[PDB]
């Protein structure tokens with residue numbers, strides 16, 4: 001009789017990241033309980049720049065302080081953008097789905113450094129330090145946040161428990177919807193900071209199950225320029241399936 005290697009979801013998810021030859025963690029929160037998965041669990045309590053995940057908080061602050069509204073159409077004023085898909089007029093929510101950086105740079109400048117720093121400190125997001133450069137503090141420092149802090153934040157958002165108005169949180173949630181099927185909903189925001197070394201990749205969001213239960217996640221991994229962006233989505237979905245969250 002041979003031996004049999006018995007793979008639990010802990011071992012499986014650890015090896016998912018190994019198979020991509022990189023280091024990553026998947027933080028899960030539900031019912032105020034946090035579990036860690038992946039091949040680099042020490043990432044969960046390490047600070048990284050939030051990159052594009054900061055758009056979630058940018059939108060909350062901008063809407064709460066009435067610097068924009070969900071129907072405002074941000075005009076493309078004619079500069080060559082990083083993607084052709086961004087070269088159009090669009091709402092804050094369409095810019096969330098596209099991760100259209102220039103719309104969120106415009107919003108950040110409307111909020112202004114003073115109000116932005118006070119709101120970020122009031123929320124206590126990450127190390128809550130934004131420095132003096134209002135249009136890139138979430139990409140090249142000094143703002144940093146751990147994956148555990150990101151799952152705590154996004155779970156509060158999902159439960160409309162952040163210290164913002166309930167309507168503002170509901171509207172930002174709606175901007176983050178990624179897929180709906182068979183009574184499940186998945187919400188989230190990807191991120192990829194390429195200008196720092198090592199590069200950091202994010203996918204933070206939550207699942208709403210058919211009975212209404214919320215299971216939040218924050219995936220955080222080291223990126224390399226050769227990877228497809230979808231490597232984060234593939235790792236998340238395979239892991240959520242292994243965990244029977246979907």
Ligand SMILES: *C(=O)[C@H]([C@@H](C)O)[C@@]1(C)CC(S[C@@H]2CN[C@H](C(=O)N(C)C)C2)=C(C(=O)O)N1
Pocket residue numbers: 050051052053099100101139190191192193194225226227228229
């Ligand atoms: C957000 O994290 C990031 C902002 C900070 O630029 C943003 C909008 C870019 C990307 S992908 C990025 C663009 N060019 C590289 C690329 O496509 N490859 C494959 C090298 C990486 C994202 C994202 O989350 O995918 N968000």
